[PDB]
Design a protein around this ligand. Structure first.
Ligand SMILES: Nc1ncnc2c1ncn2[C@@H]1O[C@H](COP(=O)(O)OP(=O)(O)OP(=O)(O)O)[C@@H](O)[C@H]1O
Ligand SMILES: [Mg+2]
Lengths: 238, 239, 213, 240, 96, 73, 48, 228
């Protein structure tokens, strides 16, 4: 147990436990699912209430006109990476006068989160960022982790009880490349409804859906515009 | 268990090293102070001269500016830094803004300087508590107090030091809603309050008053002995 | 030795309407006694209700435009809304004063709609003082346009003439007439006329040719 | 053991266990091998698919440091990304100060001294990475290097980094690598990977082959063995 | 096989505990118990019953046969505040 | 997988995914996860098991529980 | 299991056979043991 | 591992900020209610001495001429947060000629509370209630030492916080009026405090759209209490 105190201290098994504990902070937050077609990349999150009459905490937040991210984990590390995220997006607009390629922006994050996972004096960032974007070669779905690894993927679900969402995505990933937004969005939010206890339903007040498109700027819909998306659904087989 | 740091919390949310600084205040000599109609007054006890020293270097009552006073408790070393720092701020305020310094402004400086002095590790906080009395802000008499946590606060009658709980309970049954006019009556209230000293020798009281227009008027042990005589004159009505 | 400033010419016109705003400029970029191009407009659509014009030294015009467009995004993600017309004029005055001892050689005019739906024109100086006006004309031909608009828009020095507010169609032909007369006597003006109209339904554009000499 | 916390402390017999602990963290990573022929260097990495949602080419371990220099990392992948950016930055200053390409003998010295500096102070820890360096030139030929987490860096003809470090170099040394061409090497690298535990107790894998030498004119790039697919056609015939 | 642990009741537990240990005693029929469950932040079921027994002992210090609200309020200071805190109550002015 | 032979397991459960989160357990604690997961489904009257049913059975072995911790949005 | 020994077998599970109670003192350890001695309908053995 | 802001748990978590949430619990209660007519706000004083001057105890401070405030927990950390919250509304008017919205006030406040160990100290010990009427109407927000920021419709914090919330969720609805919500708020107060409710135990503060002044009640508070 004496090796379980700092980021610097290695173990006699070769595993640093402080990085292994920051993965556990990702499982505290709620579930969120991102996926993409050939032309459209949609990530869908799940709000959580604090009390019975407070507003629900937002998950999806706009970054750039072609980049939007989701969140899972500490809200302190959330806005701290967002302010680093927005600063790098407008520097390429100010210098190069082009939007950033999405694949090389995430490489700046892995260089950003590597220093506080090696030097003493700062904990690792407990955060679960899902990233959707548009470079010149189509849509992308990215995830990160507090071990500073970033994974390109075509579908991903992270957060609380998100293993049941992964099983839905693996047996329907062959259908994702062809279908358009009227069902591609509700292919995604059929995966959230297995990350729920079996007695309540995904309502209009607890879900956010963000869409960025090839000809569409990144747009966040919540609590009023979810009703054209929740129409035309079946119930759970209970 | 867990204290040994000014940055850690208790499992029930406490700062014990900040709370231990208030325990050092209770080793000091008591000093009281009231405000009145025009004349403010503050007195200290427990002089206890030791037969072989000069007594003009053991003074507990100082003036920051021309119309504000100071009385403290705690340990003598940390008071000298706070007094010498506050003389600079109540003089540099006058240079940047041509007004005289209000009694409210100098207490926020002492509290905020003690505030940031508590936050960083490796900085032992001040173990003193102070009384700031001044009828300076446009003819209005006021008195405030401080705390080692760094919370400036306003009372109308105050007691500190080793035995403040008896005196503060004494003044609640004694400070009349009838305002103590004929200001020797208000001075006799303090001498009646300081009569409940730790030994009450009579000649160990150093009362200092201010008539809100003149400078500080340190009382002599002949005028204060006259006020101790009339306190025994009113005590003759018990029989 | 090296000198950091040069004059490039240009002429910017703005008129605050009752429920509209018109911003006009030429597209001639010159230096000394040479013509760089005949297609370089000075209009810049900041928001859907605000257009800015920038004259003077062209290197500072390209810099100052990109600084404002960065701070529009910095306002929005911090406040979940867009800037107003008056908020941009308050922000621009702090940016121009921030280099007080090495000033931008840029004359600025901001025209657009307020929060009530009416026209608003703000004029500037290269150090950062501003005021709200009804019509201003900045640039190289500034002296050739202000006395005529005092006669037609402000109705100054006129007798027995009612003060009808300027309609949209009457304001279009006043803009098209002043730039024809200004391109005759000024050498830094011609080759086109870009006109931007800001209303409650968006921003329209229109291009009128001038003499090419 | 207790006397093994800091990297700036010695044991009573005279070694630092924090360097010893980080070496066998490289042991748990999958096998990446390297080999050079007489006119080139051929890399090869056994890389396993995580579950299914990997998108066929993500998070690769065949980097590209310079015009003629690349890496074959194994171990903690995030720690190798920060270390690869040092070698990208180190080769740029040699260009800007001397005007020509970095020699591989000088490049491995600059990197290994940088790895050495994280094994001395109590504030930082040693790296958990080991990697390869291969290059080719016309005035120097082909070279192949090897850097441990401690910082020892010298040259090989062939190597392996991962679980099967010993189990791969047993059958590397039975090759006549001094005279083969690096087109014949590519079909021979793929059988070394597939002999030792490609998907036996694991789930799945995918082979990556990097490539530098005389046929690329000094360039470093991935193989065109998506073209004609000949590595897997020749190595899967070794089932019996 | 099963590790059942016992913790402290948050607020709804304690308000139910006061209604158990004080239903069989002569009290005023208008008092509230939720104010009492505030003032016992880190307390057990044994400490709550000791407050209920002590409040009746104040009624025998005076000459009463029913318990008032101030009988319980003095009992909280007798049980908890006489032993849990002595520096934080008089020198309290850091928190209001 | 051995001790779960006698129950109604729904066939979307990977024991390799359970070995991801279960670590430093002996053979008997692995049996204890299998016993406790059968009774959690008995609480709500479920007829078969799920991967979520084992994950709550894991935390019950070392006797954990989770709230809304108001850090995590 | 002492009153319905059916649903454990009719689903295919086995009940646990050993329960420990731990926590702070005066919390109610003895009460839960004292209350199940009331409603047991079975052999109950206190052990000193 | 429970004495450091630079150290995680095997389960989550801190274990340092969780202890900072506990420091709010030993404060005084405070209730704020958002209504379409405006935002009312109530607090309890807990005056210790009669010689103690009452107006030197602040619980409602005026952040700006259309934004009020409320606090609980540690008084020493509260005066630091009120200082920049007055300055950040003042810097915004200097560079924009407009009033900063109530939501974006707390954005500036939360950017420094999440800097306790994240520079290159300890977290704070104070929860805050922010009420105000901006261009989106009346607003009511809430924060914490962990920087977690949220909008509430009616919130009660401090001591007696959880016990107030259960009774406060009972009587709240969307179509309230301002004068109804004021007398509804201090029915809750006299049920959660131990002293008899009078004109010296509590103080009020309201804000209206056309009445951006008067974030205080000066002995009209005696009229509200006598008609309870
Ligand atoms: N949850 C509860 N509800 C009601 N009363 C309680 C509760 N917990 C404790 N008590 C009261 O506290 C008294 C003492 O409790 P008890 O001695 O059973 O605690 P314990 O945990 O068994 O102590 P120990 O751990 O020392 O054995 C009991 O007589 C009971 O009346
Ligand atoms: Mg017991």
């Amino acid at each position: 147990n004496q090796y379980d105190n700092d980021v610097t201290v290695w173990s006699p098994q070769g595993r640093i436990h402080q990085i292994e504990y920051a993965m556990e902070a990702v499982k505290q937050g709620s579930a969120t699912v991102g996926l993409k077609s050939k032309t459209h990349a949609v990530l869908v999150a799940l709000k959580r209430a604090q009390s019975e009459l407070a507003a629900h905490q937002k998950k999806i937040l706009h970054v750039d006109n072609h980049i939007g991210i989701s969140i899972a984990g500490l809200t302190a590390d959330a806005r701290l990476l967002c302010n680093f995220m927005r600063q790098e997006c407008l520097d390429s607009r100010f210098v190069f006068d082009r939007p950033l390629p999405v694949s090389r922006l995430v490489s700046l994050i892995g260089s950003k989160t590597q220093i506080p996972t090696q030097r003493y004096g700062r904990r690792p960032y407990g955060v679960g960022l899902l990233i959707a974007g548009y470079d010149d070669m189509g849509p992308h779905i990215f995830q990160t982790c507090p071990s500073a690894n970033y994974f390109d993927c075509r579908a991903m679900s992270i957060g609380a009880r998100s293993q049941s969402a992964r099983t839905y995505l693996e047996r329907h990933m062959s259908e994702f490349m062809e279908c358009n937004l009227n069902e591609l969005v509700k292919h995604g939010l059929r995966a959230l409804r297995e990350t729920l206890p079996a007695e309540q339903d995904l309502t209009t007040k607890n879900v956010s859906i963000g869409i960025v498109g090839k000809d569409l700027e990144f747009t966040i819909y919540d609590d009023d515009d979810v009703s054209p998306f929740l129409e035309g659904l079946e119930e759970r087989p209970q | 268990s867990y204290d040994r740091a000014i940055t850690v919390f208790s499992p029930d949310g406490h700062l014990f090293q900040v709370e231990y600084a208030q325990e050092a205040v209770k080793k000091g000599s008591t000093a009281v102070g009231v405000r009145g109609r025009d004349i403010v007054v503050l007195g200290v006890e427990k002089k206890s001269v030791a037969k072989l020293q000069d007594e003009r270097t053991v003074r507990k009552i100082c003036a920051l500016d021309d119309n504000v006073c100071m009385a403290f408790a705690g340990l003598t070393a940390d008071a000298r830094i706070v007094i010498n720092r506050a003389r600079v701020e109540c003089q540099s305020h006058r240079l940047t803004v041509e007004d005289p310094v209000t009694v409210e402004y100098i207490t926020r400086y002492i509290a905020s300087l003690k505030q940031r002095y508590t936050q960083s590790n490796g900085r032992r906080p001040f173990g003193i508590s102070a009384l700031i009395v001044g009828f300076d802000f446009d003819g209005t008499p006021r008195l405030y107090q401080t705390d080692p946590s760094g919370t400036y606060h306003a009372w109308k009658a105050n007691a500190i030091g080793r035995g403040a709980k008896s005196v503060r309970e004494f003044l609640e049954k004694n400070y009349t809603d009838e305002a103590i006019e004929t200001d020797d009556l208000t001075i006799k209230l303090v001498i009646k309050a300081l009569l409940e000293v730790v030994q009450s020798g009579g000649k160990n009281i150093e009362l200092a008053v201010m008539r809100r227009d003149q400078s500080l008027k340190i009382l002599n042990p002949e005028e204060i002995e006259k006020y101790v005589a009339e306190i025994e004159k009113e005590k003759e009505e018990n029989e | 030795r090296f000198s950091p400033y040069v004059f490039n010419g240009g002429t910017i016109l703005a008129i605050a309407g009752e429920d509209f705003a018109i911003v006009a400029s030429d597209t001639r970029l010159s230096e000394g006694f040479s013509i760089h191009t005949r297609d370089s407009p000075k209009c810049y659509k900041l928001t859907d209700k605000t257009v800015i014009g920038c004259s003077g030294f062209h290197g500072d015009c390209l810099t100052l435009t990109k600084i404002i467009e960065a701070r529009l995004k910095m306002y929005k993600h911090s406040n979940n809304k867009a800037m107003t017309t008056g908020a941009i004029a308050a922000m621009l005055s702090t940016i121009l004063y921030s280099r007080r001892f090495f000033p931008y050689y840029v004359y600025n005019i901001i025209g657009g709609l307020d929060e009530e739906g009416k026209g608003a024109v703000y004029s500037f100086d290269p150090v950062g003082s501003y005021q709200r006006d009804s019509f201003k004309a900045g640039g190289s031909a500034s002296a050739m346009l202000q006395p005529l608009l005092d006669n037609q828009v402000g109705f100054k020095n006129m007798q027995n003439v009612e003060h009808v507010p300027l309609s949209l169609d009457r304001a279009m032909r006043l803009v098209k007439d002043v730039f024809i007369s200004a391109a005759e006597r000024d050498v830094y003006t011609g080759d086109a006329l870009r006109i931007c109209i800001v209303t409650k339904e968006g921003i329209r554009e229109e291009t009128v040719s001038l003499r090419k000499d | 053991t207790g006397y093994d916390l800091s990297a700036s402390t010695f044991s009573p017999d005279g070694r630092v266990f924090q360097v010893e602990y980080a070496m066998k963290a490289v042991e748990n990573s999958s096998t990446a091998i390297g080999i050079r022929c007489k006119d080139g260097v051929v890399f090869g990495v056994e890389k396993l698919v995580l579950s299914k949602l990997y998108e066929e080419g993500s998070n690769k371990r065949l980097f590209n440091v310079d015009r003629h220099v690349g890496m074959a990392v194994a171990g903690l992948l995030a720690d190798a990304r920060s270390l690869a950016d040092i070698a990208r930055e180190e080769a740029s200053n040699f260009r800007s100060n001397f005007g020509y390409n970095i020699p591989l003998k000088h490049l491995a010295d600059r990197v290994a001294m940088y790895v050495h500096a994280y094994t001395l102070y109590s504030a930082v820890r040693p790296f958990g990475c080991s990697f390869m360096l291969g290059s080719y030139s016309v005035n120097d030929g082909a070279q192949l290097y090897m850097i441990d987490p401690s910082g020892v860096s010298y040259g090989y003809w062939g190597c392996a980094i991962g679980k099967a470090r010993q189990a791969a170099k047993t059958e590397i040394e039975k090759l006549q690598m001094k005279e083969m061409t690096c087109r014949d090497i590519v079909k021979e690298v793929a059988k070394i990977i597939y002999i030792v535990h490609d998907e036996v107790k694991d789930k799945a894998f995918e082979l990556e082959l990097s490539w530098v030498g005389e046929l690329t004119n000094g360039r470093h790039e991935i193989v065109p063995k998506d073209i004609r697919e000949e590595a897997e056609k020749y190595a899967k015939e070794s089932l019996k | 096989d099963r590790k059942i642990e016992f913790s402290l009741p948050d607020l709804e537990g304690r308000t139910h505990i006061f209604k158990i240990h004080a239903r069989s005693m002569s009290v005023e029929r208008d008092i509230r118990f939720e104010l009492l469950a505030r003032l016992c932040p880190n307390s057990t079921g044994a400490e709550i019953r000791s407050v209920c027994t002590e409040a009746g002992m104040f009624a025998i210090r005076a000459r009463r046969k029913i318990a008032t609200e101030k009988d319980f309020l003095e009992a909280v200071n007798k049980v908890i505040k006489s032993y849990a805190k002595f520096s934080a109550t008089p020198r309290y002015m850091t928190y209001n | 997988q051995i001790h779960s032979r006698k129950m109604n397991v729904s066939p979307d459960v990977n024991y390799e995914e359970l070995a991801r989160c279960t670590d430093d357990f002996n053979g008997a604690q692995c049996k204890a996860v299998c016993v406790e997961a059968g009774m959690i489904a008995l609480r709500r009257g479920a007829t078969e098991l799920t991967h979520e049913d084992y994950m709550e059975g894991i935390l019950e072995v070392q006797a954990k529980k989770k709230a809304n911790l108001q850090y995590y949005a | 299991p002492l009153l319905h020994p059916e649903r454990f077998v009719n689903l295919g599970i086995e009940p646990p056979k050993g329960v420990l109670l731990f926590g702070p003192p005066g919390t109610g350890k003895t009460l839960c043991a004292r209350a199940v001695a009331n409603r047991t309908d079975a052999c109950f053995i206190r052990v000193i | 591992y429970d004495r450091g802001v630079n150290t995680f748990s095997p389960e989550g978590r801190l274990f340092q900020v969780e202890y900072a949430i506990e420091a709010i619990k030993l404060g005084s209660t405070a209730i704020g209610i958002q209504t379409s007519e405006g935002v009312c706000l109530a607090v309890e004083k807990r005056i210790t001495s009669p010689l103690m001057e009452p107006s030197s105890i602040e619980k409602i401070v005026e952040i700006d001429a259309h934004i009020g405030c409320a606090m609980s927990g540690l008084i020493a950390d509260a005066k630091t947060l009120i200082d920049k919250a007055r300055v950040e509304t003042q810097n915004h008017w200097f560079t924009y000629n407009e009033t900063m919205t109530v939501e974006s006030v707390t954005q500036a406040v939360s950017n420094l509370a999440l800097q306790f160990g994240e520079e290159d100290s300890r977290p704070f010990g104070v929860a805050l209630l922010f009420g105000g009427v901006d261009e989106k109407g009346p607003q009511l927000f809430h924060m914490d030492p962990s920087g977690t920021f949220v909008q509430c419709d009616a919130r009660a914090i401090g001591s007696a916080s959880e016990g107030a919330q259960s009774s406060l969720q009972e009587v709240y609805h969307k179509s309230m009026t301002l004068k109804e919500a004021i007398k509804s708020s201090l029915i809750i107060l006299k049920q959660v405090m131990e002293e008899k409710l009078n004109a010296t135990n509590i103080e009020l503060a309201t804000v209206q759209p056309g009445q951006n002044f008067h974030m205080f009640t000066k002995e009209e508070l005696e009229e509200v209490i006598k008609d309870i």
